[PDB]
Each structure stands twice: as structure tokens, then as C-alpha cells.
Design a protein around this ligand. Structure first.
Ligand code: SF4
Ligand code: SF4
Ligand code: SF3
Ligand code: SF3
Ligand code: F3S
Ligand code: F3S
Ligand SMILES: [Cl-]
Ligand SMILES: [Cl-]
Ligand SMILES: [Li+]
Ligand SMILES: [Li+]
Ligand SMILES: [Mg+2]
Ligand SMILES: [Mg+2]
Lengths: 266, 581, 581, 264
């Protein structure tokens, strides 16, 4: 029996593509297997063969035929400045494409800090008036998957959960999946022994740094940041920011760019 | 409507106007328009960046030590390169010298990125321009195995493997949800691979999709994560400890063993999968050695990259050479100076920005980023562009020029510069490649050549990864572990007013960040990025940029199905978020 | 010299005596001696376990909750199986029922171990008995590719790959550091593979050495580490959390995704590398279908394993069937009861232990482990043994019997029991294998058959991994997350005096642990392990065990080069630390 | 370019240390054996048996006298004249002493070779004895754990080959690189320990959130190893991550330091 897969439409606003790139790093399931076997990735400007009018035809055909049945994945965000024309798709403001795609979606995944909160383009002074998706689309379920970008295997785990269990992840008060965003970095950080002992890196490459001491005094934002980096880790479990000697920037949290210097203590 | 001459081209906007928006299989947002004549030949080409975020504005008032993290988010595809240029720039402004191991690690980070970004481009972005995925369904798996084994020692070549790949694709297509393949260009007459080569190439597309994830584990070790690893002004934060208590908290022998394992695998994949596929695309598409030349036979630019002597950015240190060629004068490579106000300048007369005088160029230390969305009459409205007005402002991309010349940057540009400077490894690699294809050297100056050079560079970078890793190990064996300089970490140690330039060669070409610091904060931060050069709009003389030039004079078989435009644009690996920042 | 008859054999210790000590490519320490007649045929065989540690003694006085961790260290090759048997035994004693997901996860642990242990045996332990590694240097890489591709769809088959492997081997040996290949049996007339099959097999040896490390990642997810994962009385410690806060601290969707990826890869490797290699060994070594039969046409034993109904160890639950055959009466498979004192008994009249009456057997609930090194009238010295005296005590291995019968256990035994009980999957797999070889069913009752059954079981277990994983996921979809029963964790909740049996099928055969608890502590802990059965010494009737019987009647081409003895012994996958504990 | 000769012998042992070695992710054990060392004797892997294996042992230790590394897995029993572990008809301790006499240095793999491990737990029926109590005139590097972490074993090997020296050790002979800190000094559940957030019974709500395993008997606070940082099996897990407390398996005498479920 050839059995259909859930339709997924992935659109891009203002963004750097870190979230797409993170997705394709998935170790398990491989992104290849996600696309071939788990979902039907029916629109994606980064990967699709069709361009221009051919891509417009794909977009129209899928959202029409599968109206009410597709998941909309959004990377990046819409700018409100210059009548929306800081991000132009098919000659018109990206926001129009966002709204059209959202209207037919059963649910929306806001990938990354961009779609969730605003990310770097929304940092002071927000020249384009970049705005997160939930301030524009207000009548749809939106699952926020923040981080700059989110962890690859968290992205693929969320997708597999939604397909396998046929439901949206349970979320916190801000719409983040509890499974990966319920605890802080600092609640699962392997340098906590050092924190609790007052054993800190004081300058880069000092003796403390060479023993893996706590990065609090170097500005680590782990104490205020919810994500899975200290437990699931990155890139098939190889590392995470703190393990490789840099404090957490706070990249999964709303407004992290403007919450002081990265090297100022929490 | 009008015609004019520039750079050997006749720019004529008579005839049918074609629009391609969105351009897919690129990063970010681009619109392209062309005019074609009655023979379906492009007589006008218009490159438009359709996004802007304003990082140069956002960076004002930031701590210079934080800048790398912000500008790294210019792009998640060429992830890391902007962080590297940023720490270089801030160190140049302040007067900071980093320890050798930090420099070596940064070179590893850059070479890793080259390997990754070039490999994924070849398969995931450009591959479907050359490989007809549907035609792979017609292949004989035994003939596919024979083809593959004639081209490479790569192990994964059994008839059963190719059958398994083919069968999975067959059932995917039978299911009726074509996904990324839906509404593509399959069957276009410019697809010239036989079925067996299409199946080989599709199998390799999938193997590359899987394998690319491994490459970036090197970024994870030294930089914590990929995308968007971490860096510091003064070196790298990944402190090393090989033989002391607490090595479990640092880059230790186990971590370095992981890195070495990735290096070997990366080189093996590139050398035995990507390289033979690039040469096979060349063999079956030789006419594309004469299409898409653009500026590549006239004006090419490299800044240079990979300083091998720590803190020395001169010609004797840089492993990837810098230089400029103009006027087709390849016998005289010219020196580049990024501080000279007469060299790199950006124009905005055809871009959505305000200058006090839009008829002149501004060097980045005098740069201004004052956005101004002003499309004029686009046969629609400000929110409905039906036809860009290329006689006025038509892009979010500024127009960089070098001494007023329009330049191409990127792998082909670098290869030409190195070749003509007499770099022996480049001369041998290029001559042997063109010999294998039975093509003249001039055949490299083309759309096909851009793709060949990219594959060459992936091979080069994989070799350099080992070189740099060995250099790091040599230092560690000699007890030289330092990874950061912190003498000038504190703002009180900095000049009250200072400025600097950070430069490198990103996968897509010549990258510069120009930064001015005052009173402990960023006063100015101007970026000129490779796709800014290549995707540039026109200047006050009407000179066209690399994309527009490369598209000029191109035959289209089927105007409505713009495969030839896609082939040429994709050959430059457009990064539109980079271009606009 | 003496001669006597037992089990259809004439045991005759006249003639030349051969000693093989150490036996290599096994776990632990074994000595084998044989006598051969004027036809170079074995007329006597002597199996000796040459190690002892005394776990049954060490476990006295321990907390029953701790026992699994101690007994897991019986063996790091069959790692986990003794922990499983122990938790089973303690749960049986106390009266604990584990939740369904704990049982499913335990079945996953067991099936993972079967896949791993059987794969590594085939290549790393037994493979060099069948493949002449040095002969691979004579192979034609293109003919090797053709052979491989005729046998399997496995991708890794290019001529260049086989050339590369061959060159790696040539380089390895060309400095004269032959390592594990030094002073081998290469060139022995019993090596029958052509050079191309030797090169294919050697390439696969290397692929298996690499790949095996991946399989055990399943043990790391659920059990923390491999070797020697962790377990608990009451279920498993790997709490599950899919959709609630803190899932980062538990078995979550990402962890389960990792497990699924390993399962698929494991099945692929077994089905496309090991299975065709096993059949190819069969095709080129058909005479070995008539060598090494031993007890396998007389007496075979399985306890059964993989309860699919949690806490139900009966026939309707066990996915790997249990039963016994004696006297060649395969039409009447008999049920096994591990509490019946007349069924499983151990004798020590030929082993280095004391009993009150060494002419009788003791059921494990009455077991005694009182070590007594007394080799009697050896040739040589009791601290430099030239010949063991098989008429006296000659091993650290006890002699288990079932109703007084000497039994073979392990993959061949299980296959025969399941076949004759009518297990459809077993009947189909066996019938297909023997039809492919044009051999009668009886050809499985042999040294070759042991190897074929082991391959069949690796494929069976890889399929069962998916089945078990799917059952776990079904439970999670239904909101059934429990992994531990803790009502009886505290010793105050236990019976003051109780006893129990834990049993399973380890890779090498039927395993039991018999435990008695009194006043919160282990009063008695007796193990009877598969290699204890197979490597058994004689009993008071002179009956021989499975190894001795399988060696009987074997022709040797070159008595000084004991390849035929190695072939037969290795076909059982001897685990001597297991056998003696 | 000849590779350094290595002789690997086995006393009383379960083979967990050999098995751990072959799990190495980077470098692969295959690459260690083919390219980094010359594994010249190893009962678990070698083709030769019996007299052929004895010939290899004799040849290697003679030709490379003073130049080979001896790897020891397991330990010698002193009971029954040493005949609780017999090799070539003789006590294993004789083979150990002969191999040790020619070695330039000795690696004591695992808790067996380092300290005694399970066979030496009360009442030590065979008088199993760690190798530094038998061999007293040679450098011995202890690499404890039951077994040690695969990529720790291969990292120590690569260090010795690359740097041409023995790793620096603590006063017990353990490599500082991997054994200089405690499990609990780098444990990702320390936040919970500090907060008094503990698992109290298996699979309780605390267990499902990854709380600290101290009250379940974790011996991480007294155990030196790299499990909480390097992790196991290509970094996939470690005991505590998968929900069981550390047993203390890298420490001398850990079997007899009370129940695994008794608090430290
Ligand atoms: S490094 Fe950061 S997250 Fe970890 S313990 Fe220190 S402050 Fe907390
Ligand atoms: S789980 Fe064990 S090692 Fe980790 S914090 Fe708790 S007591 Fe320490
Ligand atoms: Fe991830 S597209 Fe990259 S900038 Fe921060 S999430 Fe956005
Ligand atoms: Fe590692 S052989 Fe296994 S028992 Fe504890 S180390 Fe010993
Ligand atoms: S910077 Fe981001 S990637 Fe994780 S460790 Fe901090 S949330
Ligand atoms: S039991 Fe052993 S494996 Fe590590 S976590 Fe504890 S030292
Ligand atoms: Cl934000
Ligand atoms: Cl111990
Ligand atoms: Li400098
Ligand atoms: Li179409
Ligand atoms: Mg700029
Ligand atoms: Mg026993």
C-alpha cells in the first residue's frame, strides 16, 4: 500500500538559514529519512527543484489541495517596515505569503529564535520592524522551537513526535515543547559542581579554563536559558557551547541579544 | 525600449521580459528578471536582492567583543566566516595578537566550512540543475554500477545498491507526493546525462545529504555547535589540556582523535564522490564551458585567506592568495589594499539606500547604511513589483567596485588569481583537470568552470585540514598549548578611538568587515560580502555585476522553464542574506 | 591406554596425544587434548576449563538487589545476559512483576546482545578458520567485486574498494609485523575458498570490526554503557519521559530515535553482509556439514527466552522456544522444568571440586562450589601439565546433565528444538538455507550447521529488535510509561526465606541462575551456564559432553596444525569465563 | 615505519576490557591495530593457537626484549599454586612474570589488573591479586574501570604513540588526563544534588525529570573517572544519564564498599 505522508510547507522570511541547516544535521532520523519516509516536504525554497512561477505553482497547488491538513513550518520573520518590502517574495511582501500559508495550516512550527521571538534582526534598533510569527498569526496553534538555531536532533525529535503520536507536543506558557525546553541549561550543566564550589574561569585560557571550570564569571547565560544543550548536546552529542569553553549566550530566550553584553554576568 | 553598451555587452531591454521570483536552491531571497530577443537569447539581466535586515545598524553601540556573535548571524550557511572576519577586524583595530594554536584552530574552522559548504552546494543546491532525478528511474542498475566503478574507487557502487536507491525513488514518485521534485525541469533538453549517470548522481546526492552532517563535528569540538559556533576576540575559547588533571574539561586527546577521524572521512568523501561527479558533469556538459563567462575573463578579485603565520596577513603568510585582475590582464595580478579609499567602494544609485551623493562610491570606513525602499514605477505598486525598474533603484544589495571596476569573486576568481600568480598546486590541478576534459584553459571561465573550481577547492580545503591539524599537534607535542591572548581583553586597555579591517575568503568569495571603535563601543561596522559583489546592481556608469554579466548572451530553450538561468546563478552559490546583511 | 563405549562413540586414548593450550579466539582459558589413530582421526577428546574465579562463593551474603552487577562480570562478551538472568531470579524468588516496558526493554537488551555477539563471533573469532587471510593478497579485485555483487546487494563492493583493502593488507604485512596473522594456518589444505572469496571475507571482517561498536549503542541508551550495562530488580533504571518537563533527564523521543537508527543499520549489516558470507562458507565447505555432529543428532536443550507476555515464562509467551530432545527422539520434544531436582544436575567426579558424594549429581538449589585442584596422575607435574588425566579430575568446569543425559546447547540446539516444535519462522529459515546448499536437514547437525544457525539467529534477533521497539512505542502512544516496579524494593517487603530461578537463552545457549534468599541476603547462588554444558567434562557413567563428542571421529590433515579442532571448537563460540564463573 | 610492539595477556578476567577497546570510536580499533601499534600477541584475536601461539609469544618477547609494551587484562590467582588460571599447562603468573620482565612499560587495563575487581571481592576464593603486587620493578599505568571507557583506552594509546611518552599519573598510577577528577565533579545532575532534588524510588516523578541519584546509592562522589564528561560508546550515555547511580567501578575495592544502593 503506498501510503501518503503529512504535508509540510516550509517558508522563509527574514532569516540566515541556520534553522534549515540545523535540520539537515539531524543524526536520527537522518533528514533524508524524514523527507523520504516521515513527512511530505512539499515546499521549501532552499531545497526544491522548481523556481519562480514553477515554485509559485507548487505553493498554490499544495495549500489548495491540502487546505486544513498541512503543517506550516516557518523560518525567519516578517518585517513591518517599508510596507513589508524589506522581505519580498514573488514581488509582494513576505507577510502576504505568511498569511496565505497560515490560513490553510492545521498547525504552525516556529523554528528558531527568529520565528519565535525576533532574533538578531529584531535586536536594537530593529531597523526593519522584524516581528515574530505569533504577533502576526493569532488564530493558529504555534509551537515555538527557539534557539539560534535549535539543536538538530531536537528539531527532528519534535517532528518525529508529531508524526508518531499524531499530536502537538505539550508546551509551556510560551508555546515551547516541555520535553526540551522545560529545564534550564544550568539545571543540567556538567560544570555545576564548579559553580556550586565557586570555581570559575576568570580570564580566557587560565588554569581554571583548562580544567573546565564554570563560565558564570565569563558571562554564561545558562542560569536564565531554557534549552536542551547541556543534556542532548549538539551535532550527534559531540559538544555544546559551554563544553567547548564559551558561556551560553542565551540564544533560546526572547531578547537575548539586548540583555547586555555576552561577557557580563547574569 | 533602451539599449546601451558596457563591458563588451549590449544591454537591451526590448523584447519579452521574464521574471524568476523566488529564486530557489539559494540562501535567502532573490528576484531575477531578464529580457530575451526573438531567438530566446538574454539581452538584459537584472539581479535583485529581495531582503534586508540591517546588521550594520544593529551593531552600533555594541561591545566590540560581542560583535562576532551578531555578525555570525548574517548567515547560517557560510556559518562562522563572519565571526572570523569580525574577530580579525576587532583584533586589527585594538592591536591584539593571538597565539599560534588559536590561529591554527581558526584556519581549521574555515577549512571545515569550505569543505561543508562546497559539498552541500554541489549536491543539494546546484545538483538538480545537472542531474535529471526523474530520468534516474530509467537507468539500468548494472550499467550504473559499471559507470560509477569506471570513475571512482568509492566503495558504494553495487548494482543492488543502485537498484535499492532507484526503487525507493520509484515508490516515492508512485505515491504522488513529489515533494522537492514537484514541478521541476525534468526532461528539459539541456539535461544531457544518460540515465545511469543520473542514478549515480542521485545516489550521491543522498549520500552527501547524510555525510555533510559529520563534517561539522569539527566545529562542534572547537566551537561548541554548528550552525553558529563560538569564538573570542583574542583567540578561541576552547582551552586545551592533554596531560593534566581536568583534561576532561578541555580539548584533550579524545577530542583531537574525534577531529582527526572527521578529517580523514571528509577528504575521502570529497576525493572519491564529489570530485569524480564534478568531472562527470564536465564530461557530459562540455558546451557549458562556453556559457556564463560573465566577468570571469575580465575582472576577478581575491583578498586572500588562511594566514599560516599567526597574526601576519601578508602575501608570505596567506595560503590562499589575494590579488586583482582587471581588463582581462591576467599577466599582471594587482595588489589589493582594504584601507585604500580608492580601492573598495560601494555605490547605491541602483540600490534601496540613501547617500549624500549617489553618484559616487564610498569606502566602507565612510560607509552609510540608510535604507530607502524606493522602487519607482514597477508596473504595479510599491507592494506589487511586476517589473523592476533597472534604470533606477532595484535591489537591497549595494554595488561594490574595485578601483571602479566590476569584479567577480569566489572559487573561479580565486583559482584564476592563484593560477596566474604561479601557485604550483593550482597550476597542476587546473591543467590536469582541463586536460582530462580535453578543454582549453579558457573553458574554466564559464558556468561549468565555477562548478569545477568549487570541487577543486573542496579537495584543497580537505588537504589543508590535515595540514592544520598536524600543525596543532606539533605545537602540543612541544608543550605550546595557548589558545587565547587576554592582555587587551578589558576595554580600559583599548585605544579610545581605533579602526580595523578583518578579511578572508568565504566559500563564495572575498569578505571584509570594517570596524571603528570609540569609547569602548562600535561606532561603525560595515560589511562587504562576496555575494554583495557578485549579485551587485549597476553603478553610475551603468556597469553590470557578475551575475548580470554571466546571464548576458545566454540561449534559453524554453523561456518559461528557466533552467539555463538557474544553472548560471546557482554556479556562483548565491547567498542573499550575506549579500544584504 | 583404555577404550570404552559411550553415546555411540568408542573413546580410545591409544595413539598420538595432541595438546592445544592455549586455545585462542575464544573467551577465557581452555585446554584441549586429543588422541588420534593411524588414520589421523580423533578417537578421544578432552575439554578442560583452565580458569576459575568463584562468583557463586562471592555472591553469598550480598544484597539480592546487588547480585546482577556482580554476576554480570561473569562475562564481558555475553555482557548483560547474567544480569538479566539475575534480575529474573531475584524477581522469581521475591515475587516481583515488572511493568511491560521494562520487559520489552530487557528483550531489546537481549536481542541487541545476540546481534552483537553473533556478528563478532562470525568474523573476529571463527572467521580466520574459514578465510585464508594471506591468500587474499593473491585475489583479483575485479573478480572479488563480481563475486560480492553476485552474493549480495550490499553497497560496498567496488573493485577499487577491494584493491584498497588488499593494499592495506599488503602494507600491513610487508614490514614483517604480521600481528594477529603471525604463525597462522594459512595454506592448510582445509582452506577451500578461492582468493577472491578470501579478500571479500577479509574486507567484511574489517567492516564488522568497525560496525559492531554501533550495535551496542542500544545498550548505552537503556543501560548506560557497554560493556556491562546497568539493570535493576523490578525492571530497568532508564525512566521514560516523552512529553513532560525534564524529558532531557530521561529516555525521550531523541533517545528512542537513536535506538531506531541503530536497529535499522544492524538489520541491514547482518542481512546483507553476515548472512551471504555464512551461506558462501557453506557453499565452499559442504563436507563440514558431515563433521562435528557430536551430540546434535542425539541430545539438545533449550530453556527458551524472550517472554513476550510480561512476567510470563511459559510456552505461550517465550518467543524463542524451550524444550529438550534425547536419544535422537526429535518427534517428542520434552518440556523442561528448572525446579525439578531430577532434571538439571551437575556432577564433579571429573572436575576440580568436592562433593559429599561425587557419584551423584546435584540440582543447583542443592549446589556446592568447593574448589579442589587435584589433577591426579598427570603426565608432567601438577604445576606443568603435559597431559591431563581424563580418567581422573581434569577441569574447572562442572558437568551438567539433564535427566542424566549429556546435552548440546546453543544456536544449533535452539534451532533444532524450534524446528521440531513447528515454529514457522524457524522451519522456513532452515528449509531455505539447506535448500540453497542442496543439503539434507541433517547437514545442520554439524560444525558447519552451528555457524549457519548462528547467522540465522543474528537475522532473527535483528528482526525481533524492531518488533520489540514497535511494542515499546505502542505502549508510549497509549500513555503506558512505567519502567520499574518498586513495591518490593525494600527488604522488609520480602519473604524471610525464598528461592527462585532466572533463565534465558544466552548467545551460547541455555542459562540459569538459582538463588536462595534468607533474612534479606543471598544464602545460595548457583549458576549453570551454556559453555558449562557444552565444554563439560565426563560424568560417573563416562558420558562425554558436547565439545568432546563433536571432536570425536574428526580427520586431521596435519596433526601439528590443529585447524580442524579449532574449527569445531570455535563453532560453539566457547566462553570459558562463563563456563567456570 | 615499524609500529611499536604490544603483547596483550589475559589472567583471570571477563574480557570486558578487550571488548571495551574494540568499541573505540576514534581512532577505530581497526586503525589502532593496522596503523598505530603492532598487536603481536592477543589470545582473543590471534590466528595461531597452542604451540603456534606459544611460538609467537616466545619470538616476540625475545626479539623485542626491552622494547614492547605489555598490556595486562585480568589478574593472577595465588591460590592452588596458581593453578586457578592455567596457560600452557603452567600457572598464569609465570607467563605474567616472563612477559613483564621484557616489557618497557605495562598497562594494567581495568579494575581487574589495577586492583582485583570482582574475583577479588570477599572472600576472594582464588587469592586474585592485582598486577602491581606481583610485578614491582616496572612502570605500571593503571587504567581502571569495569571496564574503562573505550575512547579513554584508545586516547591513552594514541597519547603514548603520538607523544612517545607515558601519560602523567596520580599517586596511584592513573592517568591524570582522565582520572584527575571525580564523576560528581562533572556530573550534569549536580544542579539537582545542590538543590536537594533526588530520586527516592525508581521511576518516580523525580526519576522522570533526571534528578540526582545520590539517595539511590550513586558512588559518583568518591569515584575518579571520565564518564560524566567523555561519556560511553561514542558519547551516547553513561550510567547516571541512563538512570542508575555510579557503582564506583573505577575505584579499588568498590564491590566491598557496601551495597550499591546504600548512600555514599
Ligand atoms: S557554565 Fe553556565 S550553565 Fe554551566 S554551571 Fe556555570 S553558569 Fe551554569
Ligand atoms: S547523580 Fe551521582 S555523580 Fe551526579 S550529582 Fe548526583 S550523586 Fe553526584
Ligand atoms: Fe535560525 S534563521 Fe538564523 S538568525 Fe537566529 S534563529 Fe534566525
Ligand atoms: Fe575488564 S576484565 Fe571484566 S571484570 Fe572488572 S575489569 Fe575485569
Ligand atoms: S547559546 Fe544557545 S545553543 Fe544552547 S548553550 Fe546557550 S541555548
Ligand atoms: S560505575 Fe563505572 S562506568 Fe563510570 S559512572 Fe561509575 S565509574
Ligand atoms: Cl529575540
Ligand atoms: Cl577492586
Ligand atoms: Li593583527
Ligand atoms: Li507544471
Ligand atoms: Mg554592507
Ligand atoms: Mg556453577
Amino acid at each position: 500500500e503506498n501510503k501518503p505522508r503529512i504535508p509540510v510547507v516550509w517558508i522563509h522570511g527574514l532569516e540566515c538559514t541556520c534553522c534549515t541547516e540545523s535540520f539537515i544535521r539531524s543524526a536520527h532520523p537522518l533528514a533524508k529519512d524524514v523527507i523520504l519516509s516521515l513527512i511530505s516536504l512539499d515546499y521549501d525554497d532552499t531545497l526544491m527543484a522548481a523556481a519562480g512561477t514553477q515554485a509559485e505553482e507548487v505553493f498554490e497547488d499544495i495549500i489548495t489541495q491540502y487546505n486544513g491538513k498541512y503543517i506550516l513550518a516557518v523560518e525567519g520573520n516578517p518585517p513591518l517596515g517599508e510596507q513589508g518590502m524589506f522581505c519580498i517574495s514573488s514581488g509582494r511582501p513576505f507577510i502576504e505569503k505568511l498569511k496565505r500559508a497560515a490560513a490553510g495550516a492545521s498547525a504552525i512550527i516556529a523554528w528558531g529564535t527568529c520565528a519565535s521571538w525576533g532574533c538578531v534582526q529584531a535586536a536594537r534598533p530593529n531597523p526593519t520592524q522584524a516581528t515574530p510569527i505569533d504577533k502576526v498569526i493569532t488564530d493558529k496553534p504555534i509551537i515555538k522551537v527557539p534557539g539560534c538555531p535549535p539543536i538538530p536532533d531536537v528539531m527532528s525529535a519534535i517532528i518525529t513526535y508529531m508524526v508518531t503520536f499524531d499530536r502537538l507536543p505539550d508546551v509551556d506558557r510560551m508555546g515551547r515543547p516541555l520535553m526540551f525546553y522545560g529545564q534550564r541549561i544550568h539545571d543540567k550543566c556538567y560544570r555545576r559542581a564548579h559553580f556550586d564550589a565557586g570555581e570559575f574561569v576568570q580570564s580566557w585560557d587560565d588554569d581554571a579554563a583548562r580544567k573546565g571550570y564554570c563560565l558564570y564569571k565569563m558571562g554564561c547565560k545558562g542560569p536564565t536559558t531554557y534549552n536542551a544543550c547541556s543534556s542532548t548536546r549538539w551535532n550527534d552529542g559531540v559538544s555544546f557551547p559551554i563544553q567547548s569553553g564559551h558561556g551560553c549566550l542565551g540564544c533560546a530566550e526572547n531578547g537575548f541579544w539586548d540583555r547586555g553584553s555576552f561577557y557580563s554576568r547574569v | 525600449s533602451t539599449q546601451y553598451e558596457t563591458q563588451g555587452y549590449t544591454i537591451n531591454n526590448a523584447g519579452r521580459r521574464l521574471v524568476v521570483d523566488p529564486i530557489t536552491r539559494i540562501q535567502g531571497h532573490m528576484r531575477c528578471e531578464v529580457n530575451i530577443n526573438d531567438q530566446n537569447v538574454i539581452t538584459n539581466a537584472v539581479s535583485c536582492g529581495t531582503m534586508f535586515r540591517g546588521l550594520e545598524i544593529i551593531l552600533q553601540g555594541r561591545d566590540p567583543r560581542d560583535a562576532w556573535a551578531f555578525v555570525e548571524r548574517i548567515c547560517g550557511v557560510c556559518t562562522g566566516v563572519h565571526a572570523l572576519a569580525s574577530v580579525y577586524a576587532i583584533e586589527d583595530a585594538i592591536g591584539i595578537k593571538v597565539p599560534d594554536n588559536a590561529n591554527i584552530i581558526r584556519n581549521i574552522m574555515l577549512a571545515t566550512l569550505w569543505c561543508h559548504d562546497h559539498l552541500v552546494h554541489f549536491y543539494q543546491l546546484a545538483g538538480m540543475d545537472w542531474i535529471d532525478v526523474l530520468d534516474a528511474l530509467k537507468a539500468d542498475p548494472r550499467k550504473t554500477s559499471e559507470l560509477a566503478q569506471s570513475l571512482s574507487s568509492w566503495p558504494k557502487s553495487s548494482p543492488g545498491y543502485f537498484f535499492d536507491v532507484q526503487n525507493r525513488l520509484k515508490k516515492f514518485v508512485e505515491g504522488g507526493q513529489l515533494g522537492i521534485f514537484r514541478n521541476g525541469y525534468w526532461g528539459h533538453p539541456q539535461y544531457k546525462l544518460p540515465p545511469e549517470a543520473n542514478l549515480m548522481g542521485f545516489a550521491h546526492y543522498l549520500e552527501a545529504l547524510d555525510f555533510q552532517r559529520e563534517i561539522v563535528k569539527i566545529h562542534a569540538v572547537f566551537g561548541g555547535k554548528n550552525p553558529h559556533p563560538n569564538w573570542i576576540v583574542g583567540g578561541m575559547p576552547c582551552a586545551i589540556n592533554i596531560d593534566e588533571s581536568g583534561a576532561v574539561g578541555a580539548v584533550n586527546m579524545e577530542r583531537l582523535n574525534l577531529v582527526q577521524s572527521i578529517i580523514t572521512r571528509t577528504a575521502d568523501f570529497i576525493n572519491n564522490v564529489m570530485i569524480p561527479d564534478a568531472l562527470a558533469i564536465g564530461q557530459f556538459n562540455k558546451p557549458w564551458s562556453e556559457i556564463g563567462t560573465g566577468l570571469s575573463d575580465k575582472c576577478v578579485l581575491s583578498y586572500g585567506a588562511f594566514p599560516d603565520i599567526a597574526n601576519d596577513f601578508g602575501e608570505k603568510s596567506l595560503l590562499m592568495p589575494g590579488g586583482a585582475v582587471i581588463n582581462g590582464d591576467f599577466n599582471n595580478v594587482l595588489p589589493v589594499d582594504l584601507v585604500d579609499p580608492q580601492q573598495v567602494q560601494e555605490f547605491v544609485d541602483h540600490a534601496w539606500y540613501r547617500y549624500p551623493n549617489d553618484q559616487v562610491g564610498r569606502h566602507p570606513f565612510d560607509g552609510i547604511t540608510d535604507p530607502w525602499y524606493n522602487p519607482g514605477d514597477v508596473k504595479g505598486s510599491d507592494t506589487n513589483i511586476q517589473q523592476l525598474n533597472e534604470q533606477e533603484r532595484y535591489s537591497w544589495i549595494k554595488a561594490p567596485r574595485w578601483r571602479g571596476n566590476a569584479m567577480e569573486v569566489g572559487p573561479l576568481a580565486r583559482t584564476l588569481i592563484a593560477y596566474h600568480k604561479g601557485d604550483a598546486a593550482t597550476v597542476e590541478s587546473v591543467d590536469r583537470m582541463m586536460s582530462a576534459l580535453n578543454l582549453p584553459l579558457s573553458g574554466i571561465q564559464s558556468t561549468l568552470g565555477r562548478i569545477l573550481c568549487r570541487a577543486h577547492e573542496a579537495q584543497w580545503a580537505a588537504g589543508k585540514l590535515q595540514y592544520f591539524f598536524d600543525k596543532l599537534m606539533t605545537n602540543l607535542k612541544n608543550g605550546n598549548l595557548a589558545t587565547a591572548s587576554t592582555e587587551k581583553w578589558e576595554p580600559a586597555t583599548w585605544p579610545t578611538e581605533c579602526r580595523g579591517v578583518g578579511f578572508t575568503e568565504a566559500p563564495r568569495g572575498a569578505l571584509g568587515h570594517w570596524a571603528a571603535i570609540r569609547d569602548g563601543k562600535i561606532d561603525l561596522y560595515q560589511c562587504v560580502v562576496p555575494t554583495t559583489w557578485n549579485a551587485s546592481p549597476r553603478d553610475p556608469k551603468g556597469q553590470i555585476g557578475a551575475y548580470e554579466a554571466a546571464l548576458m548572451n545566454t540561449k534559453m530553450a524554453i523561456p518559461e522553464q528557466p533552467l539555463e538561468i538557474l544553472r548560471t546563478l546557482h554556479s556562483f552559490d548565491p547567498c542573499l542574506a550575506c549579500s544584504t546583511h
